[PDB]
Amino acid sequence: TIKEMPQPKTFGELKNLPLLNTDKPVQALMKIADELGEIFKFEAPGRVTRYLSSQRLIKEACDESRFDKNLSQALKFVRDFAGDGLFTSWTHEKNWKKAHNILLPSFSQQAMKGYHAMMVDIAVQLVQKWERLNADEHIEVPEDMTRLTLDTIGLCGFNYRFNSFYRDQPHPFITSMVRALDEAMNKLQRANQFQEDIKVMNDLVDKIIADRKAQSDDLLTHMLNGKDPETGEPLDDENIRYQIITFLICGHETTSGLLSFALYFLVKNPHVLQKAAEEAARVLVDPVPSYKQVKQLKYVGMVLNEALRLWPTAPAFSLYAKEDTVLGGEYPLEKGDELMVLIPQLHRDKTIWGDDVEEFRPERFENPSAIPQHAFKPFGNGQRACIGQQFALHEATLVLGMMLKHFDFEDHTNYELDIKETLTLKPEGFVVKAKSKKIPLG
């Protein structure tokens, strides 16, 4: 029959809210999920969602005929600066489908071949910084990964050099970003400089368009010259500023976390590291990698995928009932009702992955085809999936492969994993030492 939905304890008018009084709300929710299982309702003053953790219910929520992408509170707060760019528009806004079409072909093999040499440019700058550290020094891993990915999206997308490696502090653009991400996050939990941060992301916005202003085959080109082959319309003025911001944001934070997590799991798991390093050395025969070589780094790709399994860096997405409906045969839902897919919890479903979901095992991804459908979703779902998926992976495989080719890594502080949440996930304070293998670059 029709079931009552599990819900954690409520506390009068506070609801379930006192159960989330934490800077790490996703990790807290994962704990409630372990307790309560595949589905639980969660209520805060004014708001309600249902959290899903099982592949069996998330397959269902992933049926776009019944459920579309919802803007959670968080994405409503990001909406004041990202706007109706791809990531923070409703599916039914004109501008979503239109930018989708106008920006799609900018992402696959081919677009991705013409992105390559610029990826290698930032990557060699990364290798060089580490080659140049003295003996006394260590690497701040998330910080250097964000310097890389931020610069990679600025160059490949917009031909603009952030020159993040010439800086020993984070880029002005980064320091705004994290605060507002922090905010929107702290914001959710209140039962009651966010001008300085947004006010500041722009200005940079306004600097990349002048540049271009004062020919490139790039995201920015298509944002200026492309027209949606459905309606004929181009992207308008305020929409464009919205897509720039969208991609600099979306296009660097999640990728830097993925690379940070991947290195973290490799230095914690020396047998995996050894095999990942044996492949980088065998595949990467030249001074600098080619496009074809990065495609050959098979196990590096498995490593990355396994880090996305454990800690998918954009760890939750929201959906809503298009109409009145019944979920899993048990849970009726009314038009409008909200679902959040807890992705890390999904990637721990024992019915899918077996009884050792916490182990780091890249060999799980040996034959992707035997992973059920909707068991592995770090790039979201359907027409609202990550547009930059194949960009993110190509860039991360390239960078990881060259890290493992050029250095041996030491976990010198015995780093204990600490996951900071700003929406997205990163291992806060992850540090390492990299001993050079003295191999010449191009």
Ligand code: HEM
């Ligand atoms: C490992 C790296 C990445 C991860 C884990 C990731 C994750 C995701 C997820 C889960 C979504 C869906 C969000 C939702 O349903 O609300 C999304 C959407 C999106 N992502 Fe990514 N992302 C990554 C890399 C990138 C990169 C490099 C870019 C840009 C170059 C990017 C651009 C976008 C955009 C523009 C959307 C909105 C797509 C749409 O609705 O049309 N992602 N991403």
